[PDB]
């Protein structure tokens, strides 16, 4: 029921600051690198197709890894383990029935033992102090969408697409809150498909002027424009499928009218 939004929105806009990763964490990390991080999130995007997981599970899972690496240094050899226990926690928090651990040990090619995965779940838990109800881009995209006159499922499918792209690269994106990334993704999706503009309805709800969106909007444009060329492709290959109206085939606008 529409009696409870605002309160949820406000509260999501509050919870989002406390669940925040450190913006320059990849650079205090001795062994691992933004591109290792890209490879990892790409693999997790693909793990989710194989097991027909929900998209929030993938968003949630990345959040864990980022908040995990903001206080734990990891070797490049134990990253895929840190990633696996995130997707299992995320799975266990969000999915109706999650994959078995065996399945989570199998997605990784008998790399880590089932026991290693499990007692890395406990360590993830310890370090985030059982704070898993993290707000994510996908959460805010959904809360928008409601403001969409006329409704239209290519915008929705395309904003989701753009917002997953931003999971892949922390390079720019880790200095934006999900509420803004979502905002920037909703606008770019809407501007790409219809030509319309980030509406005044949620300029009041969110306090987000188009102008205030500008910076992350530019970043998320470039990222869009360059998507087909990117080292990672798992997301684009997933948003090819007609589950999504092949949003990812649509042609970026090489300008933004800003």
């Amino acid at each position: 029921v529409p009696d409870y939004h605002e309160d949820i929105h406000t509260y999501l806009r509050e919870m989002e600051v406390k669940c925040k990763p450190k913006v320059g964490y990849m650079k205090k990390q001795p062994d691992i690198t933004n591109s290792m991080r890209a490879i990892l999130v790409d693999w997790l995007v693909e793990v989710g197709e194989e097991y027909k997981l929900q998209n929030e599970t993938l968003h949630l899972a990345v959040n864990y890894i980022d908040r995990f690496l903001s206080s734990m240094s990891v070797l490049r050899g134990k990253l895929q383990l840190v990633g696996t226990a995130a997707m299992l926690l995320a799975s266990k928090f969000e999915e109706i029935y999650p994959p078995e651990v065996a399945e989570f040990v199998y997605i990784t090619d008998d790399t880590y033992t089932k026991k290693q995965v499990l007692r890395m779940e406990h360590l993830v838990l310890k370090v985030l102090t059982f704070d898993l109800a993290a707000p994510t881009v996908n959460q805010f995209l959904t809360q928008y969408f409601l403001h969409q006159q006329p409704a239209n499922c290519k915008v929705e499918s395309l904003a989701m697409f753009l917002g997953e792209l931003s999971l892949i690269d922390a390079d720019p994106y880790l200095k934006y809150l999900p509420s803004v990334i979502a905002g920037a993704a909703f606008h770019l999706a809407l501007y790409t498909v219809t030509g319309q503009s980030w509406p005044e309805s949620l300029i009041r709800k969110t306090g987000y002027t188009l102008e205030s969106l500008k910076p992350c909007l530019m970043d998320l444009h470039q990222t869009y424009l360059k998507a087909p060329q990117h080292a990672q492709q798992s997301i684009r290959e997933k948003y090819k499928n007609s589950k999504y109206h092949g949003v990812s085939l649509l042609n970026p606008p090489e300008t933004l009218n800003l």
Binding site: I32, M36, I39, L40, R76, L79, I107, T108, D109, T111
Partner: peptide, 5 residues
């Protein structure tokens, strides 16, 4: 999929 890094 072992990720080699």
């Amino acid at each position: 999929r072992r990720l080699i890094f």
